[PDB]
């Protein structure tokens, strides 16, 4: 239905979370 | 259907993220 932009929003979390995490530890 | 607590599930996570990285770079 329409939760292909939940996706999205999900992927670009997904993406979000690894770019905190690795320029925090940097 | 019931995936409506999913979407509020993942707004949580997204202010969740939001909200780590902003302590941690503080």
Do not use: C, K, M
Not at 2 to 22: P, Q, S
């Amino acid at each position: 239905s329409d939760f292909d932009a939940l996706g999205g929003r999900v992927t670009t979390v997904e993406t979000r979370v690894e770019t905190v995490n690795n320029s925090l530890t940097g």
